[PDB]
Amino acid sequence: MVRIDVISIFPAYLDPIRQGIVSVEVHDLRNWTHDVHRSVDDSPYGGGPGMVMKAPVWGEALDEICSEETLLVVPTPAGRLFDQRTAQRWSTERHLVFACGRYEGIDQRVVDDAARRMRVEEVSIGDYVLNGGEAATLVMVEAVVRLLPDGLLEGPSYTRPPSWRGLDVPPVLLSGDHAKVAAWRHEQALQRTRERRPDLLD
Amino acid sequence: MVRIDVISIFPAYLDPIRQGIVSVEVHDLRNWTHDVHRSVDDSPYGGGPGMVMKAPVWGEALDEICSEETLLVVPTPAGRLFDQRTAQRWSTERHLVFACGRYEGIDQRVVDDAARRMRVEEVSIGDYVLNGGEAATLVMVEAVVRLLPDGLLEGPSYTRPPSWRGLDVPPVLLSGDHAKVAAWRHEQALQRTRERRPDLLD
Ligand SMILES: Nc1ncnc2c1ncn2[C@@H]1O[C@H](CSCC[C@H](N)C(=O)O)[C@@H](O)[C@H]1O
Ligand SMILES: Nc1ncnc2c1ncn2[C@@H]1O[C@H](CSCC[C@H](N)C(=O)O)[C@@H](O)[C@H]1O
């Protein structure tokens, strides 16, 4: 079984995450604060464009939630790119903890302290900016959980009816020789990949 | 104002999307079915590993929801990569419709028919596989809405206290000359980018 914990100051954003193999629990980071303000952020050392999430609150939360078996994931635009191989690799883990940042991110010493006792991966889901780690956590959790018990883009798929609004299903798919269908699909996959993702051809 | 419509067979997955500039409405695709089964999928022409979403249900839904001003987004792993420039560009639109696929995706003629009357972008959020377009829609909507009224990864940030669990904030950030802080941050950004995203240096 894989146990998944998510820590966030917007726990309700993880509501879709529910939709004996996997367990999910979402925690409010403000539960490990001790001040009337329930403060989780503070001013950046060196100056900066926003606030930074405090280390003591995070360390206290991670002390309670994680153990030596934990793989701690920190969603961040400064991370390694999430990919299918990463999702497969994480699917074998027994305990994933997703630490969701907001503001400008989490004080670096949270990760440095955690790495003393567990494994930690900082991961971006793509080259675009979100407000927080929660949506990235939804994507990574879904990608992983769907893996529990070539290199061309996929081309177009069709289903019935054979004609719809003057647009016909390509005849080779209707008149089906397996070899001809595969050939047609490979050509479509290659053209699509050239058009949309030339990086995948180098 | 930007009006955002999402169409999905799992409308509840778009619940976080709520958290005079932007309007969001989620629709159940099965509302445009007419059979007792509320069927939205059918067998792939040419053979295939799964079912394909029917065109007539989608065209009927898109007839009701879209107009000539609409930019229709189809989340798909076969799409162009979503990026920050795309999110900025979409933030200027007046009407975004997100067509969420499941199973093996949507019959290609849905996109071909829609492109007769509107603009259509097929977009992937990254090189990993989800079950459906709904989580990708959460990411793209968040990236866009946060834009409404260099090229190195960001390095580490710190906030108080200056020492925590034997880990000190780097002294240059505490003893702050603006030029020295910027220099230190540029070096950290460069090393981090080399380590985690060498593709960004080519
Ligand atoms: N592409 C991405 N992948 C993973 N997490 C991301 C992400 N984009 C943003 N995040 C999450 O969002 C948090 C804040 S990033 C946004 C910072 C702030 N709004 C600003 O002025 O830019 C990060 O710490 C990370 O947890
Ligand atoms: N990286 C990505 N970016 C955008 N949409 C994606 C995506 N990965 C999956 N999707 C969405 O998920 C839908 C089904 S893809 C999964 C297909 C099926 N479960 C299988 O056997 O592989 C796509 O049509 C698209 O809407």
According to DSSP, the residues that pair with A71 across neighbouring strands are A96, A119
Is A43 an 8 Å CB contact of chain B? yes
Token readout for A39 is 């403060």
Distance B136 CA to ligand 1 centre (A): 16
Count of domains for chain A: 1
Asked if residue A192 is part of any domain, the answer here is no
Asked if residue B36 is part of any domain, the answer here is yes
Quick one: resolution in A?
2.0
Asked if residue A196 is part of any domain, the answer here is no
According to DSSP, the residues that pair with B113 across neighbouring strands are none
By Cβ distance, the residue of A12, A59, A109 closest to B158 is A109
Counting every residue written for chain B, the total comes to 202
- Find, among A59, A127, A43, A109, the residue nearest to B197 by Cα: A127
Give the number of beta-carbon pairs within 8 Å between A and B: 239
Point out the ligand nearest to the CA of residue B76: 2
- Find, among B49, B45, B39, B51, the residue nearest to B9 by Cα: B39
Asked if residue B188 is part of any domain, the answer here is no
Determined by X-ray
Q: A15 burial class (0-12, 13-18, 19+ CB within 10 angstroms)? A: middle
Token readout for B116 is 């007769």
Is A67 an 8 Å CB contact of chain B? no
- C-alpha dihedral over A197, A82, B73, B153, to 10 degrees? -80
Asked if residue A38 is part of any domain, the answer here is yes
Distance A102 CA to ligand 1 centre (A): 7
Distance of CA B5 to the CA centre of its chain: 14
Asked if residue A15 is part of any domain, the answer here is yes
CATH code at position A96? 3.40.1280.10
- Find, among A142, A130, A147, A27, the residue nearest to A79 by Cα: A130
Residues from chain B contacting residue A134 (CB–CB below 8 Å): 16
Asked if residue B140 is part of any domain, the answer here is yes
Asked if residue B167 is part of any domain, the answer here is no
> Which structural domain, as residue segments, surrounds residue A97?
2-146
